[PDB]
Point group: D2
Chain length 255, copies 4
């Protein structure tokens, strides 16, 4: 499928990023992983698919470090064919009490990192006349929730940026799109559930409690589901999908 391609997935040492990375690896792509932690387990999870991988620990709020991450991709793989901008971080507080440092960090990681990844990957994509930029946004790139000022702003910004990049690259074989997930089973969400079960509560009940307000299906989107969508967007059938923001959300945005 993607034999001969290289994908860079940000925040891919765990959760959504890792799930997407795994699907792409199985499809035959070499992977540039990024994220916190010993990367030996993550690299091994990719390499066991019979593909090459490297990792860079870049903190994507630091532009110098994002530059280092792309310089590594250029050195080891000759540049990125497929960039997955996957991100960071959340903080909940009413707008008037929303911490200034948390606003700045959420903007830096969830929004500005996407611009920097994009400006760094796009020249090589154009030069090779083939490329895919996939921005993992959120239902919160299309609607708001209480307590999430910075995250909703940042994710809406990503949806907007995606449109501009989709338009700028429209006459080329490079596309840029966004996927907007609802509730996803991440290690953090799984921890919330496990913490309920450790107290003695029922894990499925904990899930239904978490999802009831916003997600009609009461069922999680999985990293595997998102990886499969990324894989679709990288296919020939994705060639005229441009500047789109496709929601995978168990009905969140339908109401």
């Amino acid at each position: 499928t993607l034999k001969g391609k290289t994908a860079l997935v940000t925040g891919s040492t765990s959760g959504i990023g890792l799930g997407i990375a795994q699907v792409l690896a199985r499809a035959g792509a070499n992977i540039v992983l990024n994220g916190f932690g010993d990367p030996a387990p993550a690299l091994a999870e990719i390499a066991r698919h019979g593909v090459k991988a490297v990792h860079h620990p870049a903190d994507l709020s630091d532009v110098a470090q994002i530059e280092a991450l792309f310089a590594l991709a250029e050195r080891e793989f000759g540049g990125v064919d497929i960039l997955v901008n996957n991100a960071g971080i959340q903080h909940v507080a009413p707008v008037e009490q929303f911490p200034l440092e948390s606003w700045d960090k959420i903007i830096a990681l969830n929004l500005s990192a996407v611009f920097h990844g994009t400006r760094l990957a796009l020249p090589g994509m154009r030069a090779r006349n083939w490329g895919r930029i996939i921005n993992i946004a959120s239902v919160h790139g299309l609607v708001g929730s209480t307590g999430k000022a910075a995250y909703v702003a940042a994710k809406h910004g990503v949806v907007g940026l995606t449109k501009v990049v989709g338009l700028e690259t429209a006459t080329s074989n490079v596309t840029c799109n966004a996927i907007c997930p609802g509730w996803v089973l991440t290690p953090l969400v799984q921890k919330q559930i496990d913490d309920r079960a450790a107290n003695g509560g029922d894990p499925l009940q904990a899930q239904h409690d978490l999802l009831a307000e916003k997600q009609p299906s009461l069922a999680f989107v999985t990293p595997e589901h998102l990886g499969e969508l990324v894989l679709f967007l990288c296919s020939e059938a994705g060639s005229q999908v441009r500047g789109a923001a496709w929601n995978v959300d168990g009905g969140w945005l339908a109401q």
Copy 2:
């Protein structure tokens, strides 16, 4: 991959519906075809994929014929697992000059027939614990164009219907979603190209595309069938009530 599944694609005797049907057959689904013209060519295109196909000639203007369509699917194949509501027509005129019969016919086929297909297919999908309803809407379900009063109304209606059905089925293994294409080179678009050329036909074709579709490239029926196939996969399981555009950048600006 769709082996063991039955797909019904309305208006599959040409253009997009035929493209979608081909991809689903290639995936292993048995197919119920529908639409006007000689069905033999469409039947041969599907069955080359080593799958069974039948054509039913229902005029989807007529609710009784839609019912006969679904009853045949039930007797032939034991019911519809994947329903693609594709059949559609176009008429271009300013709203105050828009023929009343065209408004009624476009609403009846491009909107009401989607509701009729959906209502007929959903009970068996529920009862068998799995289903996919995919509505072929348009960029015109999300935005307007001049001269397209009935079509844009109907297509917006389809996008709204899709949300209701997606919500209603959210606690089941049935999903309902819309695909919103930009320009695809079919007889429907050719007529618009010709009416513009009435003049170099290829210049008319380019101008028609360039006005709306930044990629300056048409979407293909095969691309759209591959998306239907994706929405039929397990990865589509929590895509519900969505309207996903494949449009060369039409809606991004």
Copy 3:
């Protein structure tokens, strides 16, 4: 404000239509009322504002009757300067059990009547090079709810039709826009509340119960609020508002 103008408001013998009619009358517009009932009270409610009014009982699911309604407006007032398409009707059922006659009626009144009103009013608006068409749609022209297949389809159709008409009239002084209300205090909603109070329950509690699911403000939009918005759209400041769908919804669509 609108001295010298004529407004036709469909479904204006009560509720939202009447509220809009009243605001326009106070602004100085003559009114063409339409709807069920003895119209003497409704006409008198308009005429006491020092404006002229007429009424036609047209059932807007019957195209011949819609024609009669506009023929009356042409005869008595020389045509409509301001058309408010305000509508009909609701029915709740799962899609697979949604009655065929109810689908057809809801489409006819909530959607097709808008096309017919529009085709009948627009020639005279262009001829006079001034006009306003305002379609009272719904939050359900932008999102779905369970049990409302026909109404959501019809209201989405109205939002689409509004865009086409806004574009077709863009180079002229005629505009066409939609207002998309959330929960509105109508006589029917007031009846639901009164029925609760007659049993002994608290009226404000009944309101909070009705609104809690969908409308964060827990407060109604009123016909007066909607009339004031119509009035704004008819002002010079509305001259470049074209094909818009403006929501007044206590936060419904923000989430």
Copy 4:
């Protein structure tokens, strides 16, 4: 009508912000002006309406200066009842050539300063049981254009922020909404017209409008001030978290 109310309009020394400030003053609000250039002309435009005005020169890039802006409003007038987050800048370049300092400056002013204004104004609005926060976003908060990476991102951010704040304040008499203009003839747009003309300047002006805005007519600052005035009325009381476009048809297609 706004008699007894205090409005703060960021970036009100020219263009849209000055237009909005004028209409609010005419309505009877006392005004806190802000923005670069000689403030005397703007002060004279507002005070001709028989209202008090002060100008504070805060560079909204700088959060400490935003705080001093709001503290002055508090000492001068007892706080801000109507906040219009208007100040904004533009820079056009392809994304991969987009200056890093321009990305940061556009995000800081066109998005983060809206959050800072909002956070500073909301407590007093809540405490006094009434308020209006109106964000001047753009059609570019809803769609993209080529070369406008930072601006479109920021404006989409503003439209999202607006929804959160509208929800959060929904059980109060404070509303927060966005107005999304299409093209308005200001210095910001003039620069784009000039860069296109670099060539008849009036042809450049028309072409710039016609590409995006079907009405072939600019929106005026006065029109936008009249909308702010409407959103400040009782009829605006349940308009919450909305993004209302005034755009000559830009978003309808």
